[PDB]
Amino acid sequence: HHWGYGKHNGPEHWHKDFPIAKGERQSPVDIDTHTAKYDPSLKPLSVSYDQATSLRILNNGHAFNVEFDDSQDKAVLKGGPLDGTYRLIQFHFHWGSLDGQGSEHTVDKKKYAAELHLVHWNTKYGDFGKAVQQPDGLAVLGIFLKVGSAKPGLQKVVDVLDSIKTKGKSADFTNFDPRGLLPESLDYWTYPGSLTTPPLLECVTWIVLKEPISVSSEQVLKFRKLNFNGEGEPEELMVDNWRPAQPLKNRQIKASFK
Ligand SMILES: NS(=O)(=O)NCCNc1nonc1/C(=N\O)Nc1ccc(F)c(Br)c1
Ligand SMILES: [Zn+2]
């Protein structure tokens, strides 16, 4: 009986195995745009993905992860609210059963159809496992998805999902360029938070982009054909794999823009 997004093992149950679920810097949160304060001391975000080396795509039973070679500074996030260099390790999405839900973060209570998370770890801690034990161990770049025009840079991901339908399935996924998933603007909100999945560790600097990307209905429909279950088990569609907004508590959300 391990954690998931069902009625019996979903977000409301996670605290029983992971008491930090009720902690002081949990994610996601609602971003109240009028309460977020412009911070002129925040630098522009530096996203350097030109030498990114994707390796594999994996259905892990909760989402699909596109994994990168993080043994050298190849794809890094710097600047913004961050001190030092954060290396890209993987990206994944959260999405809904319907277009009106799916994102984890919300904006004035608005839910987007999905949310892309690019996960980076602080290279002063040597490896990801050590980084997640630190309050500034990770930086996650969050990008909202709305349904409209297709995202050309997403299609290579969409096309391979048939080969990783069920939990535990992986496929080679080389030469994917994550720059094709970014919006025009890198204006962002930032706050200190946590992993949004167990173990819910409070190790993340969240950087959530203001501008959503647009994906087609057909693209998100293919996300919804994935399975939570393993091969040869009863089919449970991988949908609504998002944690709802958590209490902001003693935190301020800062904006990079006016
Ligand atoms: N929505 S979220 O907070 O970004 N979810 C994070 C998903 N997991 C990962 N993302 O990028 N690498 C991940 C990954 N290992 O590298 N899983 C993972 C998750 C928690 C842990 F404590 C350890 Br150790 C590993
Ligand atoms: Zn995530």
CSV table of C-alpha atoms and ligand atoms in Angstrom, one decimal:
chain,number,residue,atom,x,y,z
A,1,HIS,CA,0.0,0.0,0.0
A,2,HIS,CA,2.5,2.6,-1.2
A,3,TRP,CA,1.7,6.3,-2.0
A,4,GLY,CA,0.0,7.4,-5.1
A,5,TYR,CA,-2.8,9.7,-6.4
A,6,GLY,CA,-5.9,7.4,-5.8
A,7,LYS,CA,-8.7,7.8,-3.3
A,8,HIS,CA,-7.0,5.5,-0.8
A,9,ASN,CA,-3.3,6.5,-1.2
A,10,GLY,CA,-3.5,10.1,-2.4
A,11,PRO,CA,-2.1,13.4,-1.1
A,12,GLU,CA,-4.5,13.5,2.0
A,13,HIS,CA,-2.9,10.2,3.1
A,14,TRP,CA,0.8,11.0,2.6
A,15,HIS,CA,1.4,12.5,6.0
A,16,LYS,CA,1.0,9.1,7.7
A,17,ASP,CA,4.2,7.8,6.1
A,18,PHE,CA,5.8,11.2,5.5
A,19,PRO,CA,4.9,13.5,8.4
A,20,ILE,CA,6.8,16.4,6.8
A,21,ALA,CA,3.7,16.6,4.5
A,22,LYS,CA,2.3,19.0,7.2
A,23,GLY,CA,5.6,21.0,7.4
A,24,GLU,CA,6.5,24.7,7.2
A,25,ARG,CA,7.7,24.9,3.6
A,26,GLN,CA,5.5,22.5,1.6
A,27,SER,CA,4.8,22.7,-2.1
A,28,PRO,CA,3.0,23.5,-4.3
A,29,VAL,CA,1.3,26.7,-3.2
A,30,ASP,CA,-1.2,29.2,-4.7
A,31,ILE,CA,0.6,32.2,-6.1
A,32,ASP,CA,-1.4,35.2,-5.2
A,33,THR,CA,-0.1,37.6,-7.9
A,34,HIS,CA,-1.2,40.7,-6.0
A,35,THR,CA,0.5,39.6,-2.8
A,36,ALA,CA,3.8,38.6,-4.5
A,37,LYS,CA,6.3,41.3,-4.2
A,38,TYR,CA,8.6,42.5,-7.0
A,39,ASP,CA,12.2,42.1,-5.8
A,40,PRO,CA,14.5,44.4,-7.9
A,41,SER,CA,17.6,42.6,-6.4
A,42,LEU,CA,16.6,39.3,-8.2
A,43,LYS,CA,18.8,38.7,-11.3
A,44,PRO,CA,17.6,37.3,-14.7
A,45,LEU,CA,17.4,33.6,-14.8
A,46,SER,CA,20.3,31.9,-16.6
A,47,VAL,CA,19.1,28.8,-18.4
A,48,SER,CA,22.1,27.2,-20.2
A,49,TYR,CA,20.7,24.0,-21.9
A,50,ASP,CA,22.8,24.1,-25.2
A,51,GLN,CA,25.0,21.1,-24.2
A,52,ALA,CA,22.1,19.1,-22.5
A,53,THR,CA,22.4,15.3,-23.0
A,54,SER,CA,19.2,13.5,-22.6
A,55,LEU,CA,19.5,9.7,-22.0
A,56,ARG,CA,16.3,7.9,-21.3
A,57,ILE,CA,12.6,8.3,-20.7
A,58,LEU,CA,11.0,6.3,-17.8
A,59,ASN,CA,7.4,5.6,-16.6
A,60,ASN,CA,8.0,5.4,-12.9
A,61,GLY,CA,4.4,4.7,-11.9
A,62,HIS,CA,3.6,8.3,-11.0
A,63,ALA,CA,4.8,10.3,-14.1
A,64,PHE,CA,7.2,9.9,-16.9
A,65,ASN,CA,10.8,11.2,-16.4
A,66,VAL,CA,13.2,12.4,-19.1
A,67,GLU,CA,16.6,11.8,-17.6
A,68,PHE,CA,19.8,13.7,-18.4
A,69,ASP,CA,23.6,13.1,-18.0
A,70,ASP,CA,24.4,15.1,-14.9
A,71,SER,CA,28.0,13.9,-14.4
A,72,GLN,CA,29.3,17.2,-15.8
A,73,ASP,CA,28.1,20.8,-16.0
A,74,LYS,CA,26.2,20.3,-19.3
A,75,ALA,CA,22.8,21.7,-18.7
A,76,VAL,CA,22.7,24.2,-15.8
A,77,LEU,CA,20.5,26.7,-14.1
A,78,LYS,CA,22.1,29.8,-12.5
A,79,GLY,CA,21.2,33.4,-11.5
A,80,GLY,CA,17.7,34.4,-10.5
A,81,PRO,CA,17.4,33.7,-6.7
A,82,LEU,CA,20.1,31.0,-6.9
A,83,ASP,CA,23.6,31.1,-5.4
A,84,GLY,CA,25.9,28.8,-7.4
A,85,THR,CA,25.3,26.3,-10.1
A,86,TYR,CA,22.4,23.8,-10.4
A,87,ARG,CA,22.6,20.9,-12.9
A,88,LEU,CA,19.6,19.5,-14.7
A,89,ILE,CA,18.9,15.9,-13.7
A,90,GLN,CA,15.4,15.3,-15.2
A,91,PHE,CA,12.1,16.7,-16.2
A,92,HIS,CA,8.6,15.4,-15.8
A,93,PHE,CA,5.0,16.7,-15.9
A,94,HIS,CA,1.9,16.7,-13.7
A,95,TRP,CA,-1.5,16.7,-15.5
A,96,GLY,CA,-5.2,16.2,-15.1
A,97,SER,CA,-8.0,14.1,-16.4
A,98,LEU,CA,-9.6,17.3,-17.8
A,99,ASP,CA,-8.1,20.6,-19.2
A,100,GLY,CA,-9.4,22.6,-16.1
A,101,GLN,CA,-7.0,20.8,-13.7
A,102,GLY,CA,-3.5,19.3,-13.7
A,103,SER,CA,-1.1,21.9,-12.5
A,104,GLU,CA,0.3,21.8,-8.9
A,105,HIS,CA,1.0,25.5,-8.5
A,106,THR,CA,-2.0,27.7,-9.1
A,107,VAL,CA,-2.1,31.4,-10.0
A,108,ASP,CA,-4.9,33.4,-8.2
A,109,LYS,CA,-6.5,29.9,-7.7
A,110,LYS,CA,-6.4,29.2,-11.5
A,111,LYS,CA,-5.4,25.6,-12.3
A,112,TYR,CA,-3.6,25.0,-15.6
A,113,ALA,CA,-4.0,21.8,-17.7
A,114,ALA,CA,-0.5,20.6,-16.7
A,115,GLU,CA,2.8,21.7,-15.2
A,116,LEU,CA,6.3,20.9,-16.4
A,117,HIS,CA,9.1,20.5,-13.7
A,118,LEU,CA,12.7,20.7,-14.7
A,119,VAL,CA,14.7,19.5,-11.7
A,120,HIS,CA,18.2,20.7,-10.9
A,121,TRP,CA,20.6,20.0,-8.0
A,122,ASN,CA,23.2,22.2,-6.4
A,123,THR,CA,26.6,21.0,-7.7
A,124,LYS,CA,28.2,22.3,-4.1
A,125,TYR,CA,26.7,19.0,-2.7
A,126,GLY,CA,28.2,16.6,-5.2
A,127,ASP,CA,25.2,14.4,-5.9
A,128,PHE,CA,21.4,14.5,-5.9
A,129,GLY,CA,21.0,12.3,-2.9
A,130,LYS,CA,23.1,14.7,-0.8
A,131,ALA,CA,21.5,17.7,-2.3
A,132,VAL,CA,17.9,16.7,-1.2
A,133,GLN,CA,19.1,16.8,2.4
A,134,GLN,CA,19.9,20.5,2.2
A,135,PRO,CA,17.6,23.5,2.4
A,136,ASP,CA,19.1,24.9,-0.9
A,137,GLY,CA,19.8,21.5,-2.5
A,138,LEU,CA,17.4,21.7,-5.5
A,139,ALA,CA,16.0,24.2,-7.9
A,140,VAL,CA,12.9,23.3,-9.8
A,141,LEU,CA,11.9,25.4,-12.8
A,142,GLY,CA,8.1,25.1,-13.1
A,143,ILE,CA,6.3,25.9,-16.4
A,144,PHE,CA,2.5,25.9,-16.8
A,145,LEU,CA,0.8,24.2,-19.8
A,146,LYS,CA,-2.4,25.5,-21.3
A,147,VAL,CA,-4.4,23.7,-24.1
A,148,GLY,CA,-4.4,25.6,-27.4
A,149,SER,CA,-1.8,25.4,-30.3
A,150,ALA,CA,0.6,22.5,-30.3
A,151,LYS,CA,4.1,22.8,-28.8
A,152,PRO,CA,6.4,21.5,-31.6
A,153,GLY,CA,9.3,20.9,-29.1
A,154,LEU,CA,7.0,18.6,-27.1
A,155,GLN,CA,6.1,16.2,-29.9
A,156,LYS,CA,9.2,14.0,-29.7
A,157,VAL,CA,8.2,13.3,-26.1
A,158,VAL,CA,4.5,12.7,-27.0
A,159,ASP,CA,5.5,10.2,-29.8
A,160,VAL,CA,7.6,7.9,-27.5
A,161,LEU,CA,4.9,7.6,-24.7
A,162,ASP,CA,3.3,4.5,-26.5
A,163,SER,CA,6.6,2.6,-25.8
A,164,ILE,CA,6.5,3.4,-22.0
A,165,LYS,CA,2.8,2.9,-21.3
A,166,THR,CA,3.2,1.1,-18.0
A,167,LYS,CA,5.1,1.4,-14.8
A,168,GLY,CA,8.8,0.3,-15.0
A,169,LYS,CA,9.0,0.7,-18.8
A,170,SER,CA,11.9,2.8,-20.2
A,171,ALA,CA,13.1,3.7,-23.6
A,172,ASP,CA,16.2,5.3,-25.0
A,173,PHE,CA,15.6,9.1,-25.5
A,174,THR,CA,18.8,10.7,-26.7
A,175,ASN,CA,19.4,14.1,-28.3
A,176,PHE,CA,16.2,15.8,-26.9
A,177,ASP,CA,16.6,19.5,-26.5
A,178,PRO,CA,14.7,20.9,-23.5
A,179,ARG,CA,15.0,24.5,-24.8
A,180,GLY,CA,12.1,23.5,-27.0
A,181,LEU,CA,9.8,23.4,-23.9
A,182,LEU,CA,10.5,27.0,-22.7
A,183,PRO,CA,8.2,30.0,-23.2
A,184,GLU,CA,9.4,33.3,-24.7
A,185,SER,CA,9.7,35.1,-21.4
A,186,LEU,CA,11.7,34.0,-18.3
A,187,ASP,CA,9.8,36.3,-15.9
A,188,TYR,CA,9.2,34.2,-12.7
A,189,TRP,CA,7.9,33.9,-9.2
A,190,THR,CA,10.1,32.3,-6.6
A,191,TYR,CA,9.7,30.9,-3.0
A,192,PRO,CA,11.3,28.3,-0.8
A,193,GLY,CA,9.5,24.9,-0.8
A,194,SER,CA,9.6,21.2,-1.1
A,195,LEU,CA,9.3,18.2,-3.4
A,196,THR,CA,5.6,17.8,-4.3
A,197,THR,CA,5.9,14.0,-4.1
A,198,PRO,CA,7.0,11.8,-1.3
A,199,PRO,CA,9.4,12.0,0.4
A,200,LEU,CA,8.3,15.7,0.3
A,201,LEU,CA,11.7,17.0,1.4
A,202,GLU,CA,12.0,20.7,2.1
A,203,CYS,CA,15.0,21.2,-0.2
A,204,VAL,CA,13.7,23.2,-3.2
A,205,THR,CA,14.0,26.7,-4.4
A,206,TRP,CA,10.9,27.0,-6.7
A,207,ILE,CA,11.1,29.1,-9.8
A,208,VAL,CA,7.7,29.3,-11.5
A,209,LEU,CA,7.5,31.0,-14.9
A,210,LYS,CA,4.7,33.5,-15.4
A,211,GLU,CA,4.2,32.7,-19.1
A,212,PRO,CA,2.6,29.3,-19.8
A,213,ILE,CA,3.4,27.3,-22.9
A,214,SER,CA,0.7,26.2,-25.2
A,215,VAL,CA,0.2,22.5,-26.1
A,216,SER,CA,-2.5,20.9,-28.2
A,217,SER,CA,-5.5,18.9,-27.0
A,218,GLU,CA,-4.0,15.9,-28.8
A,219,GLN,CA,-0.7,16.2,-27.1
A,220,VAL,CA,-2.2,16.2,-23.6
A,221,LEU,CA,-4.6,13.4,-24.5
A,222,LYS,CA,-1.6,11.2,-25.2
A,223,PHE,CA,-0.2,12.0,-21.7
A,224,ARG,CA,-3.6,10.7,-20.4
A,225,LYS,CA,-3.2,7.3,-22.2
A,226,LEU,CA,-0.3,6.4,-19.9
A,227,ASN,CA,-0.8,3.9,-17.0
A,228,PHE,CA,-0.1,4.1,-13.3
A,229,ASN,CA,-0.1,0.3,-13.3
A,230,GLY,CA,2.6,-2.2,-14.5
A,231,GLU,CA,2.2,-4.5,-17.5
A,232,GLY,CA,-0.3,-7.3,-17.0
A,233,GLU,CA,-2.2,-5.4,-14.3
A,234,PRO,CA,-5.7,-3.8,-14.3
A,235,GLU,CA,-5.5,-0.6,-16.3
A,236,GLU,CA,-5.5,2.6,-14.3
A,237,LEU,CA,-5.0,5.7,-16.4
A,238,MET,CA,-2.2,8.0,-15.4
A,239,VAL,CA,-4.2,11.2,-14.8
A,240,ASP,CA,-4.5,13.7,-12.0
A,241,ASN,CA,-1.0,13.1,-10.7
A,242,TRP,CA,-0.9,16.5,-9.0
A,243,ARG,CA,-0.7,17.5,-5.3
A,244,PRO,CA,-3.0,20.4,-4.4
A,245,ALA,CA,-1.9,23.7,-3.1
A,246,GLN,CA,-0.4,23.7,0.5
A,247,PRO,CA,-0.5,26.4,3.2
A,248,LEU,CA,2.0,29.2,2.5
A,249,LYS,CA,2.6,29.7,6.2
A,250,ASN,CA,5.6,32.0,7.0
A,251,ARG,CA,6.7,32.5,3.4
A,252,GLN,CA,6.8,35.3,0.8
A,253,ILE,CA,6.6,34.8,-2.9
A,254,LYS,CA,8.9,37.1,-4.8
A,255,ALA,CA,8.4,38.3,-8.4
A,256,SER,CA,11.2,39.0,-10.8
A,257,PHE,CA,9.0,41.4,-12.8
A,258,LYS,CA,6.7,44.4,-12.2
B,1,LIG,N1,7.4,17.4,-8.4
B,1,LIG,S1,8.9,17.2,-7.8
B,1,LIG,O1,9.0,17.8,-6.5
B,1,LIG,O2,9.8,17.9,-8.7
B,1,LIG,N2,9.1,15.6,-7.8
B,1,LIG,C1,10.6,15.2,-7.8
B,1,LIG,C2,10.6,13.9,-8.5
B,1,LIG,N3,11.9,13.2,-8.4
B,1,LIG,C3,13.0,13.5,-9.0
B,1,LIG,N4,13.1,14.6,-9.8
B,1,LIG,O3,14.3,14.6,-10.2
B,1,LIG,N5,15.1,13.6,-9.8
B,1,LIG,C4,14.2,12.8,-9.0
B,1,LIG,C5,14.6,11.6,-8.2
B,1,LIG,N6,15.8,11.2,-8.1
B,1,LIG,O4,16.8,11.9,-8.7
B,1,LIG,N7,13.6,11.0,-7.5
B,1,LIG,C6,13.9,11.1,-6.2
B,1,LIG,C7,12.9,11.7,-5.4
B,1,LIG,C8,13.1,11.9,-4.0
B,1,LIG,C9,14.3,11.6,-3.4
B,1,LIG,F1,14.5,11.8,-2.1
B,1,LIG,C10,15.3,11.0,-4.2
B,1,LIG,BR1,17.0,10.6,-3.4
B,1,LIG,C11,15.1,10.8,-5.6
B,2,ZN,ZN,7.0,17.6,-10.2
